[PDB]
Amino acid sequence: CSPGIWQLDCTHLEGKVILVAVHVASGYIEAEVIPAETGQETAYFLLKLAGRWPVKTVHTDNGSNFTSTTVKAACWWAGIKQEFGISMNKELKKIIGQVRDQAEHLKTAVQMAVFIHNHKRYSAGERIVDIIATD
Amino acid sequence: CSPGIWQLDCTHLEGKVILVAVHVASGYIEAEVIPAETGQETAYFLLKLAGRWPVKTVHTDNGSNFTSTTVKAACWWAGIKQEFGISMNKELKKIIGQVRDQAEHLKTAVQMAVFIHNHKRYSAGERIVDIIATD
Ligand SMILES: CC(C)(C)O[C@H](C(=O)O)c1c(-c2ccc3c(c2)CCCO3)nc(-c2ccccc2)c2ccccc12
Numbered sequence: 133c134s135p136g137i138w139q140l141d142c143t144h145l146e147g148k149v150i151l152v153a154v155h156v157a158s159g160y161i162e163a164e165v166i167p168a169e170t171g172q173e174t175a176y177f178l179l180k181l182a183g184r185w186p187v188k189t190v191h192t193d194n195g196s197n198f199t200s201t202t203v204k205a206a207c208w209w210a211g212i213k214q215e216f217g218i219s220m221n222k223e224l225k226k227i228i229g230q231v232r233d234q235a236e237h238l239k240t241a242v243q244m245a246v247f248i249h250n251h252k253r254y255s256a257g258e259r260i261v262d263i264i265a266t267d
Numbered sequence: 268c269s270p271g272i273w274q275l276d277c278t279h280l281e282g283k284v285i286l287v288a289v290h291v292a293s294g295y296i297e298a299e300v301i302p303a304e305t306g307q308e309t310a311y312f313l314l315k316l317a318g319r320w321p322v323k324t325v326h327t328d329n330g331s332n333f334t335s336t337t338v339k340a341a342c343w344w345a346g347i348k349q350e351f352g353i354s355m356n357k358e359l360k361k362i363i364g365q366v367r368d369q370a371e372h373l374k375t376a377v378q379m380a381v382f383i384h385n386h387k388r389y390s391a392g393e394r395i396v397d398i399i400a401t402d
Pocket residue numbers: 234235236237238240241244306307308310311314336337338340341342344
């Protein structure tokens with residue numbers, strides 16, 4: 133797809149919420165554990181994501197994720213539109229299970245699993261910077 | 268400098284702690300507000316940073332930041348060494364003050380200020396991906 137397209141979804145694990153952003157063209161992932169599955173957490177996460185990468189459009193598998201006033205406000209300010217042109221969430225949950233006993237906190241296992249996914253082979257982390265630099 | 272070198276420091280504002288990571292060769296920044304200025308917060312932040320970028324060595328202006336058992340453990344697992352070869356923290360505090368009234372929460376102003384710094388002109392965000400892709 134286009135180099136500005138990202139997909140955001142939440143998954144549940146251990147009674148906690150993991151927000152997962154996937155750069156669609158590359159397979160590169162950012163993820164965080166958030167306390168509540170709310171618009172404000174999504175909005176804040178979008179602000180962080182857009183200061184780091186050139187985010188043009190965002191997609192989701194649960195469209196009601198984006199009806200927040202706060203989400204719309206974050207997308208407005210960062211100049212993000214909704215992607216209309218369109219499972220690495222399962223692989224990530226798989227890597228988390230593989231490392232989970234290595235960490236006390238779930239959020240630590242998540243970041244270990246993001247690390248492994250992005251540097252596993254080129255890797256998704258190498259592909260994203262090549263795609264963005266070329267563009 | 269080398270494309271794997273990052274500098275981590277905390278600043279204080281409104282009685283809160285802002286962890287600031289600077290990619291030295293490019294001037295690109297990641298930042299978060301953390302509750303406490305502790306080793307565990309630094310360790311977790313390093314894990315996140317290293318899953319996103321190829322982090323080889325980290326520098327700091329307060330060396331005692333890195334004496335944590337947890338920090339050493341994060342650097343060990345992510346394969347990060349201490350940089351021995353070596354103020355955008357003030358510019359960032361300046362941009363934060365410029366936007367602070369736009370946001371209820373400090374952490375939101377921080378991310379607005381990271382966004383502005385990284386896309387201000389090439390921009391630091393364009394330079395980091397070119398440097399990393401070339402390398
Ligand atoms: C990441 C934080 C610090 C927020 O939480 C860790 C966790 O959830 O396990 C955590 C770690 C730690 C640090 C880096 C690390 C790993 C574990 C796993 C692989 C990647 O790199 N270490 C210790 C500990 C400190 C003193 C002695 C023995 C262990 C922790 C102690 C209490 C709570 C979390 C710890």
